[PDB]
Amino acid sequence: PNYIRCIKPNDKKAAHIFSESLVCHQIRYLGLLENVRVRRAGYAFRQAYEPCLERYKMLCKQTWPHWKGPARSGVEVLFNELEIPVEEYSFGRSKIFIRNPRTLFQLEDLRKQRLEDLATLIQKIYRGWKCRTHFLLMKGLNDIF
Amino acid sequence: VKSSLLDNMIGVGDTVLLEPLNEETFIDNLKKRFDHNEIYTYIGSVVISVNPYRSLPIYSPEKVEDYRNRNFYELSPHIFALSDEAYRSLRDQDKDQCILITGESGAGKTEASKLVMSYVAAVCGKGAEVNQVKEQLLQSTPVLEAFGNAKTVRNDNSSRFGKYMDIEFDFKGDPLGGVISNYLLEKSRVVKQPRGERNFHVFYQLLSGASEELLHKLK
Amino acid sequence: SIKAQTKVRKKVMGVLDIYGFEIFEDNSFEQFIINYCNEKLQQIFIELTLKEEQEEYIREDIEWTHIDYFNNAIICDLIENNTNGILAMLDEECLRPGTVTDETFLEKLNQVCATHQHFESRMSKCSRFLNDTTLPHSCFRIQHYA
Amino acid sequence: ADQLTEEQIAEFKEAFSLFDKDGDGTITTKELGTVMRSLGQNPTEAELQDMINEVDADGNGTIDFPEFLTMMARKMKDTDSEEEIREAFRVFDKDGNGYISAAELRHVMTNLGEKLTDEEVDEMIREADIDGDGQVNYEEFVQMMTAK
Ligand SMILES: Nc1ncnc2c1ncn2[C@@H]1O[C@H](COP(=O)(O)OP(=O)(O)O)[C@@H](O)[C@H]1O
Ligand SMILES: [Mg+2]
């Protein structure tokens, strides 16, 4: 069973008109809330080790810059260096497990700021490469400035 | 693959990740995502669609190749990721699949079944032998919805029976066919309409659409 | 036209275009069958998904804990059961001789479904919805998941 | 530091005299890090404001040359690694195969970091891939920028 819910927003067959009450009726009818509970269990979220270390290798200074294999060992020292409590997550053989989703909000926030730090790390080397190009052209033109 | 669901996210793309869980914040989520014109939101591995009543360019064949054999969680929510997870669970792991599509009449179920049929007929790559089956189902849909569907109190047209479609493949991937299977015909609507409702459409199309020699022929 | 004539071994992906759950202003037997098959779909759906999660956590040697949710299998039984289910009682009322009205069927449902938790009618014998003024006579309630 | 010998100070004096267009032996704040990025040390703008605010208690940004040599002595071997820059471009990959879509990269470079201007990111797309279009490869591009 793979499964598709369909939600009707209005009765006027319009495009931009949204009604909260009709959709609320259809949330109750279809049972979206009871669909949450079976995937909302004791661990509410999970990943695999390889796109987790691909995902958060920049939050761990041991994995930075590359990479580091094995994936469970780098993910383990990732959660060790970030010192998230051991109650909040769990290790498996082939899956990492996240109990509460607020940790997943926090880690994506910190990753989102490290993207900005990577943009700074790029832009200083690019602009200094332009200044190195200009000083490289002007340096070979004169014996002394 | 490093890309995830959490990039390009308006609101939250999953109800599982929703803090405090009620009806009201979920209405906030659907109103935010629908007003920002993102109409798909998951519950675990469950698609939620909201009908926008108009065309969006997420069904272009260029957009199909964005989704093909990318994993389920790796990208923004859309109906093709479920059919890709089912198609990879069938193709690589040999597990027969079925997609149950439920919701309000007018909420976009039949169209979604058409889009899953078109997506599978695209990604199998078997040409006219799968496009004969697809053409058969797509050109057979207004027939079945003319016979077995009728007006209710709430809607102008409503699914009064379950359409089913078998999509049958070889081990090699060659299309062996498919079977429409009807379920649960509301029979007493034929003989007794409720107040404000309507009997099945083929009688009204038969009386209103025919010529006078056909009505005098059918007595 | 499109069915294979050969009996060869095959694979299948099916799609099921079927209604959602319905609440009208006036609900009758057709809506009772419609809501019943909705109860069956929710039952088999949440049950198979529960087995899927227990399989994913039994692979990784992760201890499953029980989580509380609505059980459809009490509801479906209330309609399905061959000895006191509502379809069995209406099948009996269409079969049993004598004066068969709608009132006698509702009184039979008040007789053989009183000690059920999820059955709700005003003239039920164990009723805590007797003084519930919002329940008209010649009607009854079923505690569906919606 | 210890600090610097006469050879490296006289090496710094050449770019320092290149951006001394008036011939006064000092320059202002907004052209101050252009010498350091011209000579290859490459500090950020934010820590450049930290170095200017470190020695100035007045707030006008008048910088003397021996403190300027101390700023250059703190950032002499602080140049960042090539593989770290390479991975920093590997994060912004679209599919994990060695390219970036050009419009998303133009949106990142003008909204994160020290905010490259309009002509600099349009220059960056063409320096990254002159053949075009809408998709830039960066395997040769980082090897060209990290070489001194
Ligand atoms: N995913 C979708 N994208 C675009 N339009 C849709 C979509 N789903 C439904 N519609 C619109 O809804 C109408 C029919 O929807 P349908 O699938 O018949 O709903 P239902 O199955 O609930 O009766 C069509 O005119 C179509 O334009
Ligand atoms: Mg339909």
XYZ file of C-alpha atoms and ligand atoms in Angstrom:
686
model
C 0.000 0.000 0.000
C 1.241 3.367 -1.217
C -1.254 6.069 -0.604
C -2.592 9.415 -1.828
C -4.803 11.866 0.060
C -6.790 14.447 -1.895
C -8.055 17.698 -0.372
C -10.685 20.012 -1.849
C -10.159 23.686 -0.881
C -13.365 25.317 -2.146
C -16.800 24.676 -3.611
C -16.604 27.395 -6.286
C -14.119 25.476 -8.529
C -11.763 28.460 -8.284
C -7.978 28.661 -8.219
C -6.960 31.131 -5.493
C -9.915 30.721 -3.097
C -9.065 28.737 0.041
C -11.543 27.834 2.787
C -10.245 26.670 6.165
C -13.507 25.084 7.301
C -14.074 22.790 4.300
C -10.458 21.624 4.432
C -10.854 21.092 8.199
C -13.852 18.871 7.452
C -11.676 16.920 5.023
C -8.837 16.603 7.566
C -11.368 14.974 9.866
C -12.915 12.882 7.052
C -9.707 11.482 5.634
C -8.035 11.042 9.018
C -4.750 12.817 8.370
C -4.145 13.144 12.113
C -4.421 9.389 12.661
C -2.113 8.938 9.677
C 0.513 10.957 11.581
C 0.674 8.636 14.605
C 2.076 5.459 13.024
C 5.040 7.348 11.507
C 5.114 9.678 14.540
C 6.221 6.890 16.904
C 9.083 6.444 19.427
C 11.569 7.729 16.890
C 9.831 10.375 14.805
C 12.565 10.632 12.166
C 15.410 8.577 10.707
C 18.109 8.705 8.036
C 20.894 6.575 6.601
C 24.526 7.220 7.508
C 25.819 8.229 4.067
C 23.494 11.188 3.235
C 23.623 12.133 6.921
C 27.401 12.528 6.771
C 27.064 14.143 3.338
C 24.421 16.366 4.944
C 26.194 17.422 8.151
C 29.921 16.915 7.461
C 30.433 20.692 7.862
C 29.154 20.789 11.461
C 31.906 18.384 12.600
C 35.461 19.715 12.694
C 36.860 16.173 12.517
C 35.038 15.432 9.255
C 35.986 18.854 7.914
C 37.063 19.259 5.163
C 36.944 15.621 4.019
C 35.216 13.439 4.716
C 35.403 10.997 6.723
C 34.842 7.272 6.238
C 33.380 5.029 7.628
C 30.019 6.815 7.667
C 28.851 5.518 11.057
C 32.155 6.544 12.652
C 31.912 10.096 11.294
C 28.232 10.454 12.148
C 29.019 9.155 15.651
C 31.731 11.745 16.294
C 29.425 14.281 14.632
C 26.798 13.753 17.338
C 29.636 13.507 19.874
C 31.158 16.873 18.924
C 27.750 18.550 18.767
C 27.145 16.937 22.250
C 23.476 16.234 21.597
C 22.264 13.973 24.453
C 22.197 10.232 23.756
C 18.482 10.132 24.609
C 17.711 12.353 21.601
C 19.115 9.999 18.929
C 19.950 6.339 18.402
C 22.419 4.297 16.358
C 21.596 1.300 14.225
C 23.515 -0.930 11.862
C 22.454 0.937 8.712
C 20.232 3.776 10.021
C 20.615 6.797 12.283
C 17.516 7.629 14.338
C 16.155 10.972 15.559
C 13.621 10.855 18.398
C 12.332 14.446 18.500
C 12.099 16.649 15.375
C 13.417 19.797 17.127
C 16.952 18.407 16.798
C 16.344 18.139 13.046
C 15.224 21.786 13.025
C 18.332 22.860 14.985
C 20.865 20.939 12.870
C 19.418 22.321 9.624
C 19.612 25.815 11.131
C 23.306 25.379 11.977
C 23.992 23.866 8.530
C 22.126 26.811 6.977
C 24.518 29.233 8.666
C 27.557 27.168 7.631
C 26.383 27.589 4.019
C 26.842 31.344 4.517
C 30.311 30.747 5.969
C 31.148 28.671 2.879
C 29.959 31.568 0.716
C 32.339 33.889 2.599
C 35.174 31.350 2.163
C 34.500 31.354 -1.585
C 34.094 35.110 -2.066
C 37.304 36.148 -0.300
C 39.374 33.782 -2.470
C 37.576 34.926 -5.626
C 38.003 38.653 -4.926
C 41.566 38.105 -3.727
C 42.143 36.121 -6.904
C 41.032 39.162 -8.906
C 43.364 41.342 -6.827
C 46.092 38.733 -7.352
C 45.404 38.978 -11.094
C 45.647 42.789 -11.042
C 48.804 42.729 -8.907
C 50.169 40.014 -11.197
C 49.653 42.254 -14.230
C 50.972 45.422 -12.569
C 53.866 43.528 -10.946
C 55.300 42.409 -14.289
C 55.044 45.943 -15.715
C 57.421 47.901 -13.453
C 60.689 47.232 -11.655
C 59.526 49.186 -8.580
C 56.343 50.940 -7.451
C 22.828 11.861 -2.594
C 23.337 15.016 -0.532
C 20.165 16.876 -1.553
C 17.192 16.650 0.784
C 13.544 17.554 1.306
C 14.463 20.421 3.622
C 15.862 22.639 0.885
C 13.202 24.645 -1.014
C 10.716 24.228 1.843
C 7.694 26.483 2.359
C 6.198 25.823 5.759
C 7.060 22.187 6.469
C 6.843 19.492 3.797
C 5.957 16.770 6.305
C 3.187 16.547 8.886
C 5.397 14.135 10.878
C 7.827 16.985 11.637
C 4.987 19.314 12.703
C 5.274 20.638 16.267
C 2.339 21.099 18.129
C 0.076 18.719 16.267
C -3.581 19.660 15.988
C -6.042 20.620 13.303
C -5.268 24.336 13.505
C -1.509 24.441 12.839
C -2.079 21.896 10.075
C -4.630 24.273 8.520
C -1.922 26.946 8.839
C 0.450 24.578 7.020
C -1.954 23.790 4.168
C -2.960 27.439 3.794
C 0.683 28.539 3.679
C 1.735 25.852 1.194
C -1.376 26.242 -0.954
C -1.212 30.038 -1.021
C 2.473 29.716 -1.942
C 1.296 27.201 -4.604
C 3.042 24.061 -3.323
C 0.262 21.482 -3.329
C 2.012 18.312 -2.090
C 2.833 17.494 1.532
C 3.758 14.135 2.997
C 2.820 12.095 6.033
C 5.762 9.713 6.269
C 5.557 8.041 2.875
C 2.004 9.280 2.168
C 1.183 11.895 -0.466
C -1.191 14.730 0.400
C -2.493 16.597 -2.643
C -4.616 19.744 -2.622
C -6.423 20.652 -5.837
C -5.351 23.995 -7.384
C -7.933 23.645 -10.232
C -5.318 24.727 -12.801
C -2.156 23.681 -14.612
C 1.237 23.833 -12.926
C 4.531 23.126 -14.754
C 5.464 20.305 -12.353
C 4.049 17.853 -14.929
C 6.394 18.732 -17.791
C 8.566 15.863 -19.110
C 11.626 17.929 -18.182
C 10.341 17.800 -14.589
C 9.920 14.020 -14.936
C 13.663 13.584 -15.445
C 14.293 15.651 -12.300
C 12.416 12.998 -10.322
C 13.339 9.722 -12.022
C 15.197 7.299 -9.715
C 15.891 9.951 -7.135
C 14.945 8.659 -3.709
C 11.762 9.552 -1.859
C 13.064 12.039 0.723
C 15.846 13.566 -1.417
C 13.767 16.338 -3.020
C 10.718 18.609 -2.715
C 7.279 16.976 -2.251
C 5.450 15.805 -5.373
C 3.267 12.878 -6.424
C 5.960 11.407 -8.692
C 8.234 10.501 -5.774
C 5.684 8.017 -4.428
C 5.291 6.407 -7.847
C 9.087 6.329 -8.101
C 9.367 4.635 -4.705
C 6.697 2.141 -5.780
C 8.287 1.688 -9.195
C 11.687 1.026 -7.622
C 10.113 -1.301 -5.054
C 8.589 -3.221 -7.963
C 11.416 -2.991 -10.493
C 14.491 -3.617 -8.345
C 13.046 -5.492 -5.356
C 10.218 -7.465 -7.088
C 7.414 -6.327 -4.767
C 3.990 -5.823 -6.350
C 2.529 -2.406 -5.612
C -0.829 -0.687 -5.269
C -1.665 2.988 -4.800
C -4.890 3.736 -2.939
C -6.163 7.233 -3.735
C -8.832 8.595 -1.385
C -10.463 11.954 -0.817
C -13.413 14.214 -1.569
C -15.134 14.218 -4.969
C -13.566 17.147 -6.786
C -10.376 16.973 -4.713
C -8.284 15.513 -7.523
C -8.166 11.716 -7.285
C -8.977 10.578 -10.843
C -6.500 13.066 -12.339
C -3.846 11.811 -9.913
C -4.463 8.231 -11.060
C -4.130 9.431 -14.665
C -0.814 11.098 -13.795
C 0.546 7.967 -12.113
C -0.466 5.970 -15.205
C 1.250 8.506 -17.480
C 4.351 8.544 -15.265
C 4.750 4.757 -15.222
C 4.100 4.556 -18.974
C 6.831 7.173 -19.387
C 9.480 5.669 -17.105
C 9.069 2.090 -18.328
C 10.076 3.126 -21.850
C 8.120 0.442 -23.712
C 6.482 2.652 -26.351
C 3.229 1.797 -28.107
C 2.699 -1.431 -26.160
C 2.372 0.510 -22.907
C 0.761 3.536 -24.569
C -2.028 1.289 -25.854
C -2.804 0.372 -22.239
C -2.472 4.009 -21.141
C -4.618 5.198 -24.066
C -7.135 2.478 -23.158
C -7.501 3.635 -19.544
C -7.404 7.386 -20.247
C -9.911 7.115 -23.086
C -12.079 4.758 -21.003
C -12.344 7.082 -17.965
C -15.234 9.362 -19.172
C -17.194 6.226 -20.118
C -17.039 4.741 -16.605
C -17.561 8.144 -15.002
C -20.594 8.645 -17.231
C -22.228 5.347 -16.294
C -21.361 4.952 -12.645
C -21.191 8.502 -11.257
C -23.944 10.936 -10.370
C -24.768 14.186 -8.605
C -25.103 14.236 -4.809
C -26.218 16.900 -2.343
C -22.697 18.244 -1.911
C -21.154 17.828 -5.377
C -22.182 18.105 -9.013
C -20.421 14.805 -9.740
C -19.211 12.199 -7.290
C -17.364 8.896 -7.264
C -20.143 6.421 -6.465
C -17.907 3.374 -7.010
C -14.262 2.423 -6.886
C -12.296 2.303 -10.143
C -9.382 -0.121 -10.047
C -6.556 -0.669 -12.508
C -4.141 -3.578 -12.777
C -0.883 -2.608 -14.475
C 0.731 -5.933 -15.351
C 4.408 -6.313 -16.279
C 6.867 -9.028 -17.257
C 9.996 -9.842 -15.274
C 11.876 -8.087 -18.092
C 9.715 -4.959 -17.814
C 7.617 -5.686 -20.900
C 3.968 -4.673 -20.408
C 1.757 -7.722 -20.164
C -1.371 -5.615 -19.783
C -3.863 -4.332 -17.241
C -7.374 -4.896 -15.920
C -10.019 -2.371 -14.912
C -11.937 -3.709 -11.914
C -15.027 -1.935 -10.601
C -16.087 -2.070 -6.947
C -19.174 -1.136 -4.929
C -21.744 0.173 -7.379
C -24.322 2.221 -5.457
C -27.241 0.284 -6.856
C -30.220 1.862 -5.069
C -29.481 5.208 -6.720
C -30.746 3.579 -9.945
C -34.185 2.944 -8.471
C -34.533 5.652 -5.815
C -32.808 9.011 -5.901
C -32.594 10.939 -2.630
C -33.935 14.466 -2.417
C -31.768 17.069 -4.121
C -29.628 14.345 -5.695
C -29.518 12.710 -9.097
C -29.685 9.252 -10.706
C -26.765 8.046 -12.844
C -25.646 10.407 -15.622
C -26.261 8.081 -18.588
C -30.040 8.468 -18.255
C -29.832 12.259 -18.385
C -27.318 12.135 -21.230
C -29.579 9.597 -22.936
C -32.728 11.705 -22.652
C -31.165 15.119 -23.188
C -28.603 14.161 -25.826
C -30.532 11.934 -28.213
C -32.340 12.777 -31.431
C -36.101 12.393 -31.715
C -35.840 9.333 -33.963
C -33.646 7.665 -31.335
C -36.071 8.503 -28.516
C -38.927 7.246 -30.673
C -36.788 4.192 -31.465
C -36.014 3.437 -27.802
C -39.709 4.159 -26.969
C -8.424 -5.750 -25.542
C -5.461 -5.166 -23.222
C -5.560 -8.306 -21.052
C -2.942 -10.917 -21.865
C -4.350 -14.225 -23.078
C -1.280 -16.117 -21.853
C -1.154 -17.423 -18.274
C 2.528 -16.484 -17.732
C 3.913 -15.367 -14.371
C 3.764 -11.611 -14.018
C 4.060 -8.578 -11.755
C 1.524 -5.861 -10.978
C 1.159 -2.243 -9.916
C -2.465 -1.265 -9.394
C -4.176 2.041 -8.687
C -7.449 2.399 -6.785
C -9.497 5.512 -7.507
C -12.084 5.430 -4.719
C -13.975 8.001 -2.608
C -13.068 9.576 0.692
C -15.097 9.524 3.879
C -18.461 11.266 3.726
C -20.726 13.129 6.123
C -23.919 14.445 4.553
C -26.781 16.358 6.108
C -28.807 13.134 5.742
C -26.965 9.803 5.858
C -28.534 6.541 4.685
C -27.564 2.938 3.906
C -25.391 3.753 0.892
C -23.327 6.068 3.065
C -23.244 3.256 5.628
C -21.594 0.976 3.060
C -19.313 3.808 1.842
C -18.162 4.618 5.386
C -17.801 0.888 6.100
C -15.351 0.328 3.250
C -13.552 3.442 4.457
C -13.233 1.732 7.864
C -11.788 -1.340 6.162
C -9.266 0.745 4.177
C -8.110 2.562 7.318
C -7.899 -0.737 9.226
C -5.720 -2.575 6.705
C -3.707 0.587 6.002
C -2.674 1.426 9.575
C -2.141 -2.279 10.313
C 0.238 -2.861 7.379
C 2.056 0.429 8.073
C 2.493 -0.666 11.707
C 4.048 -3.937 10.514
C 6.308 -1.912 8.187
C 7.625 0.203 11.077
C 8.153 -2.853 13.285
C 10.118 -4.446 10.429
C 12.316 -1.365 9.963
C 13.075 -1.241 13.685
C 13.543 -5.000 14.059
C 16.174 -4.817 11.309
C 18.208 -2.150 13.137
C 17.685 -3.963 16.507
C 15.689 -0.964 17.757
C 13.055 -1.595 20.419
C 9.535 -0.767 19.300
C 7.239 0.900 21.812
C 3.463 0.894 21.557
C 1.774 4.142 20.546
C -1.920 4.806 21.080
C -4.234 5.374 18.117
C -7.775 4.683 16.955
C -8.575 1.022 16.298
C -10.775 0.523 13.240
C -11.036 -3.233 13.840
C -13.604 -2.710 16.589
C -15.657 -0.567 14.193
C -15.462 -2.919 11.189
C -16.440 -5.859 13.429
C -19.523 -3.869 14.514
C -20.672 -3.953 10.895
C -18.977 -7.165 9.730
C -19.866 -9.722 12.416
C -22.003 -12.626 11.256
C -23.927 -12.895 14.526
C -24.485 -9.316 15.703
C -23.108 -7.088 12.939
C -25.326 -4.417 11.441
C -25.223 -5.933 7.958
C -26.045 -9.312 9.488
C -28.964 -7.779 11.363
C -30.268 -6.034 8.259
C -29.735 -9.200 6.241
C -31.761 -10.976 8.925
C -34.456 -8.258 8.907
C -34.724 -8.625 5.145
C -34.964 -12.384 5.712
C -36.956 -12.823 8.940
C -40.749 -13.047 8.597
C -43.354 -10.723 10.035
C -43.751 -6.967 10.248
C -40.464 -5.561 8.951
C -40.173 -1.781 9.172
C -37.311 0.598 9.784
C -38.441 1.053 13.395
C -38.162 -2.667 14.149
C -34.668 -2.726 12.652
C -33.585 0.206 14.812
C -35.080 -1.533 17.842
C -33.143 -4.674 16.937
C -29.976 -2.568 16.779
C -31.014 -1.220 20.184
C -31.258 -4.814 21.417
C -28.153 -6.533 20.011
C -25.694 -3.606 19.985
C -26.356 -1.983 23.367
C -23.313 -3.328 25.238
C -21.017 -2.319 22.369
C -18.751 0.640 23.121
C -18.899 2.335 19.715
C -22.619 1.944 19.025
C -24.620 5.027 19.973
C -28.395 5.365 19.941
C -30.948 7.112 22.104
C -33.209 4.138 22.850
C -30.291 1.796 23.502
C -30.674 -0.165 26.711
C -27.266 0.749 28.180
C -27.480 4.314 26.889
C -25.455 7.211 28.220
C -26.811 9.161 25.243
C -30.460 8.904 26.307
C -30.587 12.477 27.639
C -28.407 13.568 24.704
C -30.996 15.861 23.107
C -28.910 16.063 19.894
C -29.829 12.503 18.878
C -33.144 12.377 16.995
C -35.276 9.268 17.089
C -35.401 7.138 13.917
C -31.611 7.651 13.705
C -28.453 6.285 15.297
C -24.772 7.158 15.609
C -21.663 5.161 14.742
C -18.375 6.307 16.273
C -16.220 6.396 13.145
C -12.676 7.763 13.146
C -13.849 11.062 11.653
C 55.002 37.033 16.115
C 58.784 37.406 15.974
C 58.298 39.328 13.477
C 58.867 39.748 9.711
C 62.229 40.220 7.971
C 62.984 43.106 5.622
C 62.336 41.055 2.465
C 58.669 40.350 3.205
C 58.046 43.896 4.472
C 59.537 45.294 1.254
C 57.378 42.757 -0.601
C 54.323 44.221 1.151
C 55.499 47.782 0.396
C 55.006 47.224 -3.341
C 51.256 46.564 -3.250
C 51.021 49.096 -0.408
C 52.627 51.626 -2.766
C 50.446 50.477 -5.670
C 47.298 51.416 -3.773
C 48.999 54.558 -2.440
C 47.771 56.717 -5.324
C 48.481 59.956 -3.443
C 51.935 59.000 -2.150
C 51.409 59.511 1.577
C 52.553 56.276 3.237
C 49.064 55.283 4.430
C 45.659 54.454 2.947
C 42.080 54.438 4.213
C 39.908 51.589 5.487
C 37.961 50.522 2.393
C 41.140 49.973 0.340
C 43.156 48.475 3.216
C 42.355 44.787 2.715
C 42.812 45.081 -1.050
C 46.573 45.046 -0.424
C 46.299 41.914 1.749
C 44.103 40.181 -0.833
C 46.422 41.389 -3.601
C 49.378 39.722 -1.890
C 47.494 36.464 -1.307
C 46.794 36.431 2.437
C 43.002 36.908 1.902
C 41.243 37.884 5.149
C 37.498 38.354 5.241
C 35.816 41.748 5.385
C 34.435 41.067 8.876
C 37.798 40.251 10.438
C 39.282 43.168 8.499
C 36.873 45.412 10.416
C 38.037 43.520 13.518
C 41.665 44.375 12.728
C 40.812 48.035 12.066
C 38.692 48.317 15.226
C 41.353 46.425 17.224
C 43.879 49.276 17.257
C 41.582 52.300 16.733
C 39.888 53.681 19.834
C 38.931 56.935 18.095
C 36.819 55.417 15.313
C 38.180 57.145 12.195
C 40.208 54.199 10.891
C 43.655 55.808 10.719
C 46.081 52.884 10.424
C 49.841 53.038 10.951
C 52.282 50.862 9.027
C 53.876 48.829 11.917
C 50.416 47.715 13.103
C 49.670 46.975 9.435
C 52.734 44.700 9.437
C 51.316 43.016 12.549
C 48.010 42.406 10.740
C 50.018 40.892 7.892
C 52.050 38.832 10.363
C 48.910 37.307 11.874
C 47.614 36.339 8.412
C 50.851 35.265 6.694
C 50.364 31.497 7.066
C 46.599 31.815 7.680
C 45.875 31.148 3.990
C 43.196 28.497 3.606
C 43.634 25.088 2.021
C 42.832 24.168 -1.577
C 40.856 21.012 -0.736
C 38.771 22.946 1.815
C 37.814 25.448 -0.904
C 37.153 22.516 -3.268
C 34.758 20.864 -0.800
C 33.180 24.296 -0.228
C 32.274 24.224 -3.918
C 31.239 20.556 -3.645
C 28.522 21.493 -1.137
C 26.651 23.709 -3.647
C 26.473 20.943 -6.283
C 23.055 20.201 -7.762
C 23.341 16.448 -8.383
C 26.727 15.474 -6.933
C 28.531 15.247 -10.283
C 30.684 18.385 -10.463
C 28.732 21.471 -11.573
C 26.439 24.210 -10.267
C 23.329 25.623 -11.935
C 24.121 29.241 -12.740
C 20.981 31.025 -11.516
C 21.001 29.379 -8.078
C 24.712 30.173 -7.721
C 24.036 33.783 -8.732
C 21.328 33.882 -6.059
C 23.692 32.469 -3.415
C 26.682 34.709 -4.184
C 24.598 37.922 -4.036
C 22.784 37.037 -0.790
C 25.324 35.164 1.378
C 28.840 36.085 2.408
C 30.364 39.471 1.667
C 27.890 40.005 -1.217
C 29.664 40.098 -4.605
C 28.275 42.837 -6.834
C 26.371 42.587 -10.114
C 29.353 42.620 -12.480
C 31.443 40.311 -10.283
C 29.025 37.365 -10.251
C 28.245 37.881 -13.957
C 32.011 37.785 -14.402
C 32.109 34.673 -12.186
C 29.659 32.705 -14.356
C 31.732 33.462 -17.468
C 35.068 32.703 -15.775
C 33.589 29.422 -14.544
C 32.220 28.269 -17.924
C 32.661 30.407 -21.042
C 30.768 27.911 -23.230
C 27.519 28.172 -21.260
C 24.770 28.284 -20.514
C 22.947 28.105 -17.175
C 25.394 25.483 -15.881
C 28.972 26.061 -14.734
C 31.719 23.510 -14.131
C 34.198 24.186 -11.340
C 36.937 21.530 -11.551
C 39.319 23.688 -13.601
C 37.943 26.880 -12.027
C 39.166 26.138 -8.498
C 42.549 24.979 -9.833
C 42.882 28.336 -11.571
C 41.876 30.365 -8.529
C 43.883 28.525 -5.843
C 47.218 28.705 -7.698
C 49.609 31.459 -6.608
N -3.071 17.485 -9.539
C -3.855 18.290 -10.293
N -3.317 19.211 -11.118
C -4.089 20.015 -11.869
N -5.434 19.980 -11.867
C -6.107 19.105 -11.084
C -5.329 18.190 -10.235
N -6.214 17.434 -9.569
C -7.448 17.830 -9.961
N -7.391 18.819 -10.862
C -8.579 19.459 -11.468
O -9.746 18.821 -10.947
C -10.644 18.440 -11.993
C -11.036 16.972 -11.888
O -10.515 16.394 -10.693
P -10.810 14.852 -10.338
O -9.519 14.071 -10.314
O -11.972 14.382 -11.176
O -11.319 14.987 -8.825
P -12.071 13.760 -8.124
O -11.231 12.561 -8.486
O -12.027 14.143 -6.667
O -13.449 13.774 -8.740
C -9.942 18.678 -13.314
O -10.680 19.641 -14.068
C -8.569 19.210 -12.962
O -8.313 20.435 -13.651
Mg -12.498 12.392 -10.155
